[PDB]
Amino acid sequence: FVEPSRQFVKDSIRLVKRCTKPDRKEFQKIAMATAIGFAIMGFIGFFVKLIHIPINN
């Protein structure tokens, strides 16, 4: 029957309540690295698109 599914549910709540959620202070620095990498490499993507622009015409 379904009771083990509800047991899994309460397992999930217990795990989440036991998990170490990020706070604002470390979020502000962890997301910074993601933004920096995103920008620094999307820049190279945009540059190669720009270099493709003239070779077509």
Partner: protein, 388 residues
């Protein structure tokens, strides 16, 4: 021997600094970045403009030999030439069948590209570890994310309206131009908001971890922590479900003559600006399919990848690391309290993020964005080595 007919990368036996490291791994990234469509997310063949062969030979070169085995630097020397040889054979096979999808010029060009990329695999893997295609997905996704500012002015055709000048900033043409138009043709505002929001939510969920206390066995006093990540599998469930999506839709395209027209609507990823509800049997149940799929894939990957509770306990025993209060055998139970359910809930939550990104309609159909964030975090984790 038969591997004596190929070259190989030089062995790093000296200190390998960050500057020259990006000079090796992050330079000559333009070769594939020069200039069955459901596989282009993972194999950006497209029209084969010198990018038609990635990942497909990279892993297979070794894994097909390992699989057929059932049919250390010394083993490296034994297999080094042969793995590349068979990778290039299968590369030529893929090229000729893609041609099926006189023409020797294009095939040999594809072979040259594959040769360069395979020989570069070991070059990137030494040290930082960007080989195995881990960079290709982010490379093909990052352009689809950022090049909106080039797609908006470069589209010379205007259709019924006028959009030749641009869409990011074109208010002065009418201002009064209204941005509250239909969000199906060029929805810059909604796409950007969805993209940044999904980035933010996946970052927030990414720092979820459980810190198990650990102590070194002989140095009584040295305390430490061991992290159990919430996903604990990163992209594996999403990768596997993307593989199933490909194997379904490309097969449907193959069998059509033998998804959004002329085909059954039994399974499909519901896409519509805002929302659409006409038959709940597919609009909502898609969420259940995705969630169960991701959870199952994570749960089976736990056993496949050798990251189960007992395996991790054995690794910790190998490293002499122990928990303070528990017998050397009861540590397995403490890990087991989290690891399996952590993996299952990671699958569920990552699927939920996928369906939320699909609902918001972010860039790249939600999938890949999660690959994007996980790959960036993997790069960060590798960069951690420089600081430790």
């Amino acid at each position: 021997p038969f591997c004596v007919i190929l070259p190989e990368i030089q062995k790093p036996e000296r200190k390998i600094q960050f500057k020259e490291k990006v000079l090796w791994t992050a330079i000559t990234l333009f070769i594939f970045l020069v200039c069955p469509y459901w596989m282009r997310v993972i194999l950006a063949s497209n029209r084969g403009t010198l990018m038609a062969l990635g990942i497909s030979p990279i892993v297979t070169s070794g894994l097909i030999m390992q699989l057929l085995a059932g049919a250390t630097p010394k083993d490296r020397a034994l297999f080094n030439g042969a793995q590349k040889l068979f990778g290039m054979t299968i590369t030529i096979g893929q090229s000729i069948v893609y041609v099926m999808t006189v023409c020797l010029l294009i095939t040999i060009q594809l072979f040259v590209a594959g040769l360069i990329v395979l020989l570069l695999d070991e070059l990137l893997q030494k040290g930082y570890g960007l080989g195995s295609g881990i960079s290709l997905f982010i490379a093909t996704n990052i352009c689809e994310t950022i090049v909106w500012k080039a797609f908006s002015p470069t589209t010379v055709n205007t259709g019924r309206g006028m959009e030749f000048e641009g869409a990011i900033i074109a208010l002065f043409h009418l201002l009064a131009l209204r941005e509250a138009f239909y969000r199906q043709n060029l929805p810059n505002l909604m796409n950007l908001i969805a993209t940044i929001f999904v980035f933010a939510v996946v970052i927030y969920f990414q720092g979820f971890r459980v810190d198990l206390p650990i102590k070194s066995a002989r140095y009584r006093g040295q305390y430490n922590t061991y992290p159990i990540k919430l996903f604990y599998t990163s992209n594996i469930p999403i990768i596997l479900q993307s593989a199933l999506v490909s194997n379904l839709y490309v097969i449907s395209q193959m069998l059509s003559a033998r998804p959004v027209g002329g085909l059954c609507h039994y399974l499909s990823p519901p896409e519509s600006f805002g929302s659409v509800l006409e038959d709940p049997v597919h609009a909502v149940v898609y969420i259940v399919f995705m969630l169960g799929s991701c959870a199952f894939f994570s749960k089976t990957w736990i056993e496949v990848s050798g990251s189960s509770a007992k395996d991790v306990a054995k690794q910790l025993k190998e490293q002499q690391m122990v928990m303070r209060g528990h017998r050397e055998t009861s540590m397995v139970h403490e890990l087991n309290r989290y690891i399996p359910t952590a993996a299952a809930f990671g699958g569920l939550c990552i699927g939920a993020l996928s369906v939320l990104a699909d609902f918001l309609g972010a860039i790249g159909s939600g999938t890949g964005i999660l690959l994007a964030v996980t790959i960036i975090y993997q790069y960060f984790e590798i960069f951690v080595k420089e600081q430790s």
